[PDB]
Design a protein around this nucleic acid. Structure first.
Ligand code: SAM
Length: 93
RNA sequence: GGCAUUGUGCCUCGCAUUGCACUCCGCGGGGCGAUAAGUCCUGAAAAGGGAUGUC
């Protein structure tokens, strides 16, 4: 899939609460770059999943390649580039 | 605070779900104004916060 500012993470432990999940993802991935936002939802369509938006694509690339399959709340993270640009980055340029 | 209607999101349990969102609600039980959260509301914005009717 083509590089993107946003990484799409699925295979997340669904028992983890939205607030704690959002911040855990934020604290871990902030190692790889400045983060613009993280969207997380435990709805049917959106649970187990997350979009973390990075400021710079190099950072998402680095994050995607270094964090692939990482054991996170007893599960390995599946990490892909996002198919389409996030709304916050689509406007900026 | 009791009722009626209701926007908005949250927690938990059973079953189910590997799902590409920002146009956002699995079903079924249970519990929630509490800035937690919020896609709903007020403000010009910061920031703040359920609402209408009703004893
Ligand atoms: C009509 S029920 C809520 C139904 C909900 N829209 C649903 O899909 O199931 C109204 C009650 O829900 C609870 N509630 C709704 N929104 C709340 C919130 N944002 N914070 C705390 N309690 C809430 C309160 O207990 C309130 O008295």
């Amino acid at each position: 899939t083509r590089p993107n500012h946003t990484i799409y993470i699925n295979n997340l432990n669904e028992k983890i609460k939205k607030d704690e999940l959002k911040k855990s993802l934020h604290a871990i991935f902030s190692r790889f770059g400045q983060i613009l936002d993280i969207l997380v939802k435990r709805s049917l369509k959106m649970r187990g999943q997350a979009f973390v938006i990075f400021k710079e694509v190099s950072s998402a690339t680095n994050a995607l390649r270094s964090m692939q399959g990482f054991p996170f709340y007893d599960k390995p993270m599946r990490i892909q580039y996002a198919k389409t640009d996030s709304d916050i980055i689509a406007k900026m340029a």
